[PDB]
Amino acid sequence: ELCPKIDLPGFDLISQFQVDKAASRRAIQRVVGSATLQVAYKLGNNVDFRIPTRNLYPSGLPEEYSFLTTFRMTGSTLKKNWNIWQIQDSSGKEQVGIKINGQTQSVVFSYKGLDGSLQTAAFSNLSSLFDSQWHKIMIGVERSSATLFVDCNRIESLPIKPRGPIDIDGFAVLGKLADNPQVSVPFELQWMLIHCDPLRPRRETCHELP
Ligand SMILES: [Zn+2]
């Protein structure tokens, strides 16, 4: 449904979560991004960006897709474990998500397996991502693998098990602390996209990361 066979469509999450609107309504601050002409949005601070899961993924996520985002974090945020994006059930339990694990300087892709357990693909050794500068991370979710790209460089590919159904009675939310779904973490957001083409990250360039 979200991604029909056939180029393949993509979804602008900054648009869907109405981040731009919130900035145009003085809810959050807009700042210069990774490059002079780029606009970024400052987050965290107790703005709640969440959308009922049923409103976006009534049938869950497709088998294959890619998640791409350009963001910046600094100070205390660098040591926190937080989900830049995730789908959680009504109680706040993660169904699928992309976690920036500052405690181990790694990025973790979590997903529900066929038996309902939460499986993970942990990409470690990513110290370069925690330097307070702008970075772009992309994850290509394929049939049996998940591949991480950082600043347009292929970093590593890990095997992943078949995805099971997810609970859709919750919400898709942005920048929430890994342990507490009610706590937002401050960070700057410049781009966030979910694309139907799992190989979408391969044709991305990073000229905007001076
Ligand atoms: Zn539930």
Side-chain angles (χ1 to χ4, degrees), residues 89-90 167 169:
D89 65 14
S90 63
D167 192 348
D169 63 20

Side-chain angles (χ1 to χ4, degrees), residues 86-155:
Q86 75 177 297
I87 289 176
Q88 63 188 193
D89 65 14
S90 63
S91 299
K93 309 311 169 186
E94 182 171 31
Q95 302 299 296
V96 183
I98 298 195
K99 176 166 60 181
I100 302 174
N101 220 68
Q103 277 300 90
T104 64
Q105 299 197 320
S106 61
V107 167
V108 182
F109 170 66
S110 298
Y111 61 95
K112 281 303 193 67
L114 295 178
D115 65 351
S117 65
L118 189 59
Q119 297 295 314
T120 64
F123 302 98
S124 298
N125 300 54
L126 299 177
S127 62
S128 59
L129 184 54
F130 302 77
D131 65 352
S132 297
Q133 302 294 156
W134 279 94
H135 293 294
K136 180 184 297 176
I137 65 172
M138 310 180 273
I139 294 183
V141 176
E142 280 183 272
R143 178 174 182 284
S144 313
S145 61
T147 305
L148 170 70
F149 301 75
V150 174
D151 298 344
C152 296
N153 291 308
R154 177 181 171 291
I155 302 303

Side-chain angles (χ1 to χ4, degrees), residues 192-210:
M192 195 180 285
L193 165 78
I194 285 184
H195 202 284
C196 287
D197 185 350
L199 311 184
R200 171 69 180 74
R202 302 178 81 262
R203 51 177 176 290
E204 182 68 9
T205 55
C206 287
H207 304 165
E208 79 276 28
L209 294 178

